[PDB]
Amino acid sequence: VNSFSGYLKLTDNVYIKNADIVEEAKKVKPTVVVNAANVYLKHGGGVAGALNKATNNAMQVESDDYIATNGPLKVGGSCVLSGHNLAKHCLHVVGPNVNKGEDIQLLKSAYENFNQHEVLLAPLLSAGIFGADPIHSLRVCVDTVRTNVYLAVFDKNLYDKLVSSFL
């Protein structure tokens, strides 16, 4: 049993809810929250800017030190950093950004990072300002992630479309 409430069950391991990932993290304090990161860990907009704002910029300060030491992530890659006030850990995952021309085949590699964690609160990778089709992102998630993933979909209209169209 876990703390996640109000989710629709899609498969054995994937759950979905219309919720603001920030407000959900604040309520649950999950072991792992996933950030929709870029390779520079520059949290300016979308899930990254919102999560980072909720940490009072502490996520960005930690991230800048990580990049200064290690250099940029790979598209499809990840790193584990603090969850600050939102979670124990933040798994920063880089999905391909279609609005930068990145290979959508890298979305499966991105979701494979989730398999290193038994339970996660996450957004749909490469959705929103990353430009991918969220229906596609949900299909790759279901077909790739084997651990227990709780997906937060901010947009109520998109959420209802994801549920209604789910095979």
Ligand X SMILES: O=C(O)C(c1ccccc1)c1ccccc1
**What is the nearest approach in angstroms of ligand X to the Cβ of residue 70?**
25
Q: Which stretch binds ligand X (CB under 6 A): 42-50, 60-68, 102-110, 135-143?
A: 42-50
Q: Tell me whether residue 8 or residue 50 sits nearer to ligand X (CB atom).
A: 50
Q: Tokens representing 158?
A: 């998109």
Asked if residue 33 binds ligand X (CB under 6 A), the reply is no
Cβ-contact 123, 47 below 8 angstroms: yes
Q: Tokens representing 46?
A: 């979308």
Cβ-contact 24, 16 below 8 angstroms: no
**What is the nearest approach in angstroms of ligand X to the Cβ of residue 20?**
6
Asked if residue 86 binds ligand X (CB under 6 A), the reply is no
CA distance 76 to 161: 26
CA distance 63 to 68: 9
Place of tokens 């490469």: 126
User: Across-strand partners of 82?
Assistant: 89
Q: Tell me whether residue 79 or residue 154 sits nearer to ligand X (CB atom).
A: 154
Q: Tell me whether residue 83 or residue 128 sits nearer to ligand X (CB atom).
A: 128
**What is the nearest approach in angstroms of ligand X to the Cβ of residue 71?**
26
Asked if residue 98 binds ligand X (CB under 6 A), the reply is no
Q: How far is CA 94 from the centre of its chain?
A: 9
Write out the residues near ligand X by the rule CB under 6 A. 20-21, 46-47, 50, 123-124, 127-128, 153-155
